[PDB]
Amino acid sequence: PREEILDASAELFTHQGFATTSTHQIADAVGIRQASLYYHFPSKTEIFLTLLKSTVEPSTVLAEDLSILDAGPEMRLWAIVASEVRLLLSTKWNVGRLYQLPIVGSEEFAEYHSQREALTNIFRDLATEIVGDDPRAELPFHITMSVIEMRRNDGKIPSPLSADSLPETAIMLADASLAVLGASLPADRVEKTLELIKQAD
């Protein structure tokens, strides 16, 4: 029930934006009364904040586990990029699209800002391990987020989460993120990250 409301909200917010969307629309989309929505969420801001968090929280939690990979920065950066893109592709709606809404900057979404800042920092310092004090350390994060401009947004999931497979687009973008730094690709990178994903459970 909660999951349904969040999905319907993603659909409305990605197509109409935040300002234009009412809670009335969200209730009708899900086929429930406005009262039963109010029970699960007080306002459309709370819903929006929950969506934004859902797209960065899981990857920051994952980046805890990166040091336990007994591996170099290239491998660690590849795995993070790939698993981030994996999550962005695992959803019914293109919820990553939401960060581009101008509303997101406001102080209400401070919890989201902090998580985004944490993630951005993890990407950057890993890249700095590879190229040092170079402006290219900025690129891997932006290449990762470019998938939001690539995927579908019609309710069908681009790539459902598999225990034993990474989607081609995640492999591409992760390969591309090391390529811009001039880093060589670890041969075992796909298994190694699938392994890491598996022992986050």
Give the nearer residue to a copy of itself in terms of CB position, either 75 or 139. Answer: 139
Tell me the C-alpha distance between 1 and 132, whole Å: 48
Q: Choose the binding region for a copy of itself from 2-10, 32-40, 73-81, 167-175 (rule: CB under 8 A).
A: 167-175
Q: Is 16 near a copy of itself (CB under 8 A)?
A: yes
- What per-residue string of b and e applies to 162-193 under the rule 16 or more CB within 10 Å gives b? eeeebbebbbebbeebbeebebeebeebbebb
Tell me the C-alpha distance between 93 and 47, whole Å: 15
Of the residues 139, 166, 174, 197, which one makes contact with a copy of itself according to CB under 8 A: 139
Footprint of Ca ion on 101-160 (CB under 5 A): 152-154, 156
Torsion of CA 83, 89, 94, 96, to 10 degrees: 10
3-state secondary structure of 201: coil
* Cα distances (Å, whole numbers) of residue 37 to 12, 15, 47, 48, 109: 15, 21, 10, 14, 21
- Shortest distance, CB of residue 138 to a copy of itself, whole angstroms? 7
Q: Is 198 near Ca ion (CB under 5 A)?
A: no
Of the residues 110, 157, 179, 200, which one makes contact with a copy of itself according to CB under 8 A: 179
Give the nearer residue to a copy of itself in terms of CB position, either 118 or 145. Answer: 145
Closest C-alpha among 171, 173, 168, 116 to residue 148 = 173
Give the nearer residue to a copy of itself in terms of CB position, either 12 or 196. Answer: 12
Of the residues 34, 36, 43, 100, which one makes contact with a copy of itself according to CB under 8 A: 100
Identity of residue 117? E
Of the residues 4, 28, 108, 138, which one makes contact with a copy of itself according to CB under 8 A: 138
* Residue ranges binding a copy of itself (CB under 8 A): 14-17, 19-20, 100-103, 135-136, 138-139, 142-143, 145-146, 149-150, 168-169, 172, 176, 179-180, 182
